[PDB]
Design a protein around this ligand. Sequence first.
Ligand code: U7W
Ligand code: U7W
Lengths: 305, 305
Amino acid sequence: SGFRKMAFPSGKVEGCMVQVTCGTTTLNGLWLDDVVYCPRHVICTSEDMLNPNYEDLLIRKSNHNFLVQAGNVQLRVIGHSMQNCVLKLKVDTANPKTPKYKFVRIQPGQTFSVLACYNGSPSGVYQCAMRPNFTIKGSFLNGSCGSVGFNIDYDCVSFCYMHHMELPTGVHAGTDLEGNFYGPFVDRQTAQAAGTDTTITVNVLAWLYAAVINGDRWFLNRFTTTLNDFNLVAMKYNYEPLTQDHVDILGPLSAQTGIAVLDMCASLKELLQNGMNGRTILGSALLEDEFTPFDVVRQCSGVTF
Amino acid sequence: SGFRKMAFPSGKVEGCMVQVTCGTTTLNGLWLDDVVYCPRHVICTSEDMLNPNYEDLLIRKSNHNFLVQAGNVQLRVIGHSMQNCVLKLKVDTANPKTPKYKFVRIQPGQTFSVLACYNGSPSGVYQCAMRPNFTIKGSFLNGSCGSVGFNIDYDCVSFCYMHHMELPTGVHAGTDLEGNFYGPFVDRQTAQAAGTDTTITVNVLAWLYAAVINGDRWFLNRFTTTLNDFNLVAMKYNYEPLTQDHVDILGPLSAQTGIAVLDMCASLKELLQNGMNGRTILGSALLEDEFTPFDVVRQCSGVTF
Ligand SMILES: C[C@H]1c2ccsc2CCN1C(=O)Cn1nnc2ccccc21
Ligand SMILES: C[C@H]1c2ccsc2CCN1C(=O)Cn1nnc2ccccc21
């Protein structure tokens, strides 16, 4: 027992990280098969950044301008293209360390692991959620651009995130591996509004189930609620609406604990209306929304890769 | 910016995990050079567990009784010895994936990453502290025994922890890699008192520095304190005493923020006496004690391996 914010083992991804240099800028790339993926803003200079013309900037570059280094080994670049906000550099060698992998665009509220890297070298790994407003609350310093987020299912790495920028508000934004931003963001240095964020209700409930499984049970109460009544409360507290699809995905946890989903909603209701009265749940004094129902079951059942 | 509970990249350790089976019990081993390390309780059965006679149990075992499997590859065991609470199985092949490594006994209050494994396969990675009472608050299910904790400095993995057991209170206990338990624990199924635990004061202060660096500054106040006055408060709130050695290690963070260590103590004092008044610091509604001063600087300066 016990419950922690657990990341995927990062080995399969560490083997894919490289450094990509263009002019004076260095950041991280992802080397899969014979293609290196990185943020297209590697080709910008400081003047370029307020409104880069990426098409014009890329035209002034040739294959030999992109320096790609994997540990000590230099890779030879034989083609380049821009897809959306990512650059794809074709190299002459397939990465021998390439895992089975897929590219996925995840949904808001889903979680993934981030391998933070600088100069193509891994620094640390942590678990994140894609916020409902399509930002992530990460830990990234300058030089972390091109760090990726991923999930692993058996032997298969599903890459879902590549880091591009920190917004002036101090949260993070980036793309899928086809170079499409999550959210309304663009790769230029402007103030950019991230929408209203909300709490991921289905995750909080998953985490409450996790707490019961681990024997934190003090917040269980004598009440129940309806989906409609609960959603009135959810809206007041800036929680995402709970749908029957959400209730359905919580089914396995409901079965395991014998606590019906709507009874657990009535617990959550009481916590939202009354707070925690200075108590803790799984070591936390607020309601945690960065564990999916899938995450709770995996951690509580101990799936490996 | 941003601040997360970040684990070391786990790749170097994943390459060292194996499954070790003796009779009906399977758990995890660590394969370094030509030696596999695992918890000695692999040789017990259910009857054995209340007070195993490990010497007598081991005498009934031969090299060929220890089945060691690394992925699909079976290893040949050519020697066995018990050191303290660990078994050391000599195998005929050096692990080709062995990193530069050291074995270290860490101090209470130090942090490390855990790679949770089942049947020799990695499941997840997370960051922990060794509690002042020499327990860890992990996430371990049955079959996780032999999972290890580690730190990495450049290319060198310092192994500090091997998981042995969950206590009836639901916290975790284990050994260094020489098989010496942290704390008073023994590898037999009895009720075992873990001492009074305290909060790791030097870590809380490191984390407050981290919050200032990231722009969470609301708890900074107009006050200062002395080491003696602060320690009166620390004792009332079951915090570890702060020593000048602690003040010294916080020096770099003090320099970076320009906030003297004792002024940050006066902030912490006010938080202990007044609570957080329903506010948060770095996304937390309690005082976090699982980041060392070294951790904060690394994360805030972005060191790689
Ligand atoms: C100005 C901004 C930007 C805006 C549009 S594209 C782009 C690339 C450069 N940039 C960054 O934010 C880079 N970056 N990413 N994560 C960071 C964490 C700490 C510091 C810098 C960081
Ligand atoms: C009975 C106890 C024990 C006590 C003395 S040696 C020993 C080995 C077996 N054991 C464990 O606790 C094993 N274990 N370790 N982490 C766990 C998490 C969830 C469930 C079982 C777990």
